Structure 1
Amino acid sequence: APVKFVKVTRVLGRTGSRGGVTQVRVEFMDDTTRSIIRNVKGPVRENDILVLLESEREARR
């Protein structure tokens, strides 16, 4: 599968029923113009790098 690498640029509060998930703005590190919103389970800092199996799906708000 064409797995893609994305990096987080900003964190926008903590969502979810139990605060485990966080909602972030990510950057694809291959087309620096593109940016979407995703959800993450673990702690996240600025300039962290995440591995994304599928990118089309989008999260709430």
Structure 2
Amino acid sequence: APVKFVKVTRVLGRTGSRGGVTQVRVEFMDDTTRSIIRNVKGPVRENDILVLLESEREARR
């Protein structure tokens, strides 16, 4: 399980569902192009470096 650092561009306003879970737009940090959207618990803003595990997650609510 290699660790992939990652950061944030957009905060996805009207989508985020089921409680305080913020869904967020994510631009990868080592290769600064590949951008997936991830599910984030807790307070998160733009320009905020997130640490994610295995990136084979394409799901939402």
State TM-score, norm by structure 1: 0.83
Q: Which consecutive aligned stretches of 4+ in structure 1 deviate over 6 angstroms post-superposition?
A: none
15 and 41 in structure 1: CA distance in 2 versus 1, 3 angstrom threshold: farther
CA RMSD of aligned residues (A): 1.9
Paired-residue identity, %? 100
Task: Point out where structure 2 has 5 or more consecutive residues left out of the alignment.
Answer: none
State TM-score, norm by structure 2: 0.83
Aligned length: 61
Within 1, Cα distance between the matches of 2:58 and 2:5? 16
User: Deviation of residue 16 (structure 1)?
Assistant: 5.5
